[PDB]
Structure formats: C-alpha cells, structure tokens
C-alpha cells in the first residue's frame, strides 16, 4: 500500500493484501477506567501528608500510565494504617484545621481504615505537567530553577494527619484522560532485555 | 493462540522468528536514508496486566 | 523428560508459607489412561475396617 508520507494521515494495512485473513479482537484490558482502578503504594511521612496524585513513583504501573496524559479527572480512595485518630481536610483549608475533631475523623479500628473522598479542586480538570515557569551564581540558579519548576499548589485532593502514619495507598475511580504523551520502556544494553520468567 | 511479550533474551533460542530488510538495487542513491516507523494492527490485542517496575 | 514450563497457573510468594491446598472447578477430562490399585502379596489385600 503506497501513500504520501508527509500528509500525516493514518493508514493501516491488513493481511488481506497478500491473501491472509483478519480475526476477532477483544480489547477490554486496555481501557483507561479498568486498568487504573487498583491500589498503589506511596512512601508516607510521619505526621502530615498532602494527598497529591503525583507522589506515586513513576516506574509503577499506575504511576507511568497516569503520566502519559496531560489532563485528567478522578475521585479518590485511600487506605491508611495509623495510630490514634485520622482527620481529613478539604482542598485549600488552613493548616490549623488538622487539629479539630469536627472535620471527618475516623477512630482507630484494626487493622486499617479505607475511605472514599470526592474531588474538591476549583479547576475543571487537573494536569500532570504545567508550563508556568516559562522555561558566581552556579549553584544558586541550579537550586532556584529546580524548585521553580514544580506544579501549582492547588493540584491536590486535601490532607490527612495522624499521630503516626505507616502505610498509605491510592485508588482512582471514574478515571478520564486527555491529550496523550510519551511512554518509554527500559532500554536494553544487549540485543534484548529479558525478564527471568517463572521457571526452575 | 497467544505469545509472550517478556524474556529479554541476550541468549539463544529464538521463538517467534526474524524479519529481514534487503536492498535489491539502486541508481545513484549513495548516502540517502530510509526512515521506518512501527504501529499496531487491526486485530492486535493485549492481555493479563502485571507490574515489574520498569 | 519433564513437562513444558507453560503448564502452570501462576506463582505465589510470602514471607513464609505453611500450608497450601488446591481445588479444581468445572473440571473436564479427555482421552483416558491406566489407573492401578495396590498389588496384594497374599490372596487379598485387606484394609482393617472400622471395628473394635
């Protein structure tokens, strides 16, 4: 099948070009809603944690598959293993409110506590990457720009605080994604990079 | 009916075959390039998600 | 002379495993093969049935 290259139009060639046969497809496992619906571990901090979806590591399954979208939307579920009592606080609230009990507080019950939180940001959609920073003093500019190219601060789902936090896992519901981005695999050094499959 | 995506070989024992690109002939085309891309097909399918931290 | 390696249902791992039991559902079977009993040495091989 010949065509013009520069035109940038999609073109697909089936196996019927040389006498073959085209079979049936089932693509349930690649849907965005399905694949992104599972728990992912996060390294927690002792007292105060800010629930932000960019804290999942970029190498895990959810982390990278999330990072191949420019804009997204989802609700949230968390599963926390703590001591004491756990208090949640909505987006954009003072940090003194982490001590008040009238805010949703879950009393300790072993082993863990699973919650469901809504989406409380003021924007219509969130973003994984943001072009706001518009980009002797050798180290000065290094550590100035390195901290001057993060995301805005209103891209979060709230905060939680407890006497001590030991585990913390995220789960996304009703995920939607816009405007795809690159996604790369581990670059082999030899002719192939092989996992050692289950075999004795 | 299905085939594996895993097993970085760095070894012997090919399983699924090879593909070979040849140059039959050419007229006054020394140094000119041929770029090549890849994409999925009509009936490509992918199953059984896993997490190996890559 | 073992079987191929893709004849399995997956794998499990834990800090320590103490017991493990299998249960099959919706079993289907094809092409029967031999099945043999314990060969007696005497005229009969007898289990000691429930009796005092």
């Amino acid at each position, epitope marked *: 099948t010949t065509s013009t290259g520069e035109s940038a139009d999609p073109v697909t060639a089936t196996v019927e070009n040389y006498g073959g046969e085209t079979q049936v497809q089932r693509r349930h496992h690649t849907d965005v809603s399905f694949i992104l619906d599972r728990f992912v571990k996060v390294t927690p901090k002792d007292s105060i944690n800010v629930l932000d979806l960019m804290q999942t590591p970029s190498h895990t399954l959810v982390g990278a598959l999330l990072r191949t979208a420019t804009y997204y939307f989802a609700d949230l579920e968390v599963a926390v293993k703590h001591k004491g009592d756990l208090t949640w606080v909505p987006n954009g609230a003072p940090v003194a409110a982490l001590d008040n009990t009238t805010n949703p507080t879950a009393y300790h019950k072993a082993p863990l506590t699973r919650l469901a939180l809504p989406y409380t940001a003021p924007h219509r959609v969130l973003a994984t990457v943001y072009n706001g920073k518009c980009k002797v003093r050798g180290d000065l500019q290094v550590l100035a720009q390195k901290a001057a190219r993060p995301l805005p601060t209103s891209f979060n789902y709230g905060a939680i605080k407890a006497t001590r936090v030991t585990e913390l896992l995220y789960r996304m519901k009703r995920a939607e994604t816009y405007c795809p981005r690159p996604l790369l695999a581990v670059h082999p050094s*030899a002719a192939r990079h*092989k*996992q*050692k*499959i*289950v*075999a*004795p | 009916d299905y085939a*594996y995506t*895993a*097993s*970085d070989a*760095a*070894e*012997t024992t090919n399983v699924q075959g090879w593909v070979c690109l040849f140059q039959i002939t050419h007229g006054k085309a020394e140094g000119d390039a041929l770029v090549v891309l890849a994409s999925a097909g009509k009936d490509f399918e992918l199953r059984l998600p896993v997490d190996a931290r890559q | 002379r*073992p079987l191929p*390696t*893709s004849f*399995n249902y*997956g*794998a499990i791992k834990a800090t320590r495993v103490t017991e493990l039991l299998y249960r099959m559902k919706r079993a289907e079977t094809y092409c029967p093969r031999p099945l043999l009993a314990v060969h007696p040495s005497a005229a009969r091989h007898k289990q000691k049935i429930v009796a005092p």
Partner: nanobody
Amino acid sequence: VQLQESGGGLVQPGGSLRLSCVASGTVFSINDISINHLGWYRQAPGKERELVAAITADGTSAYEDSVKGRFIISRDDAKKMVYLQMNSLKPEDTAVYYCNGLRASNAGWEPRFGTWGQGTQVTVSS
C-alpha cells in the same frame, strides 16, 4: 547477565581451594523456572574447552570420569550462589574454570544460554 568468579590466581599444588561464583545476580526472566541447571567448564591451552561437572535443579550431580569422585559441587539458592570444591589436587587441574549454566538436551548438556564469562585460572606445577 554475565557471571563473575573469584578465588583464583597463582597457587601451589597441594593446597585447598573453594572457587566462588560471584554472579551478576541472575536477573533471569519469567516464572518458568526449575530449569535452573548450572555447571562448570574447564579450558585447555589451544584445546577446546571441556566440561567438568553440571548440577541439576535440585540434587543430581555428574562429573567427567577423569575427575569423578575427587570434586564436590553444591548450590545455595536461598542466597543464589554456587561454589566448586577442590580437593585431591593433581597436576591435571591446570585449566580456566567458567561458572555458567546448562541446556539439558536429549543427547547432552549444551552451553550458554549466555553472552560469555570471564573465568579464573588455577595452574599448579611442581
């Protein structure tokens, strides 16, 4: 992907050696396992490198009947290392030993299954 060894060099005949296999880690792929069959090869000057021994997945061990009964091999999978014991030292030990894996074909074990090794040499001459 490439196995290192240690414990060699220049040594006098009549000592006691335990060659050690400092593996790269054996990143080896999918759960299709229990084909873990390592081995040891020796190599002669200008003469084709010959086998010495081979270890099966759990417990079987064979050796070349030249060295049969004299050497002892065993693997420790809990930490994923394998070693080679060297007792009853003869002049025949002058060869470079390669810690590698086996193929276990119908006729005989085939070689790597790898890129290549570096090796450690034990040449003894009195």
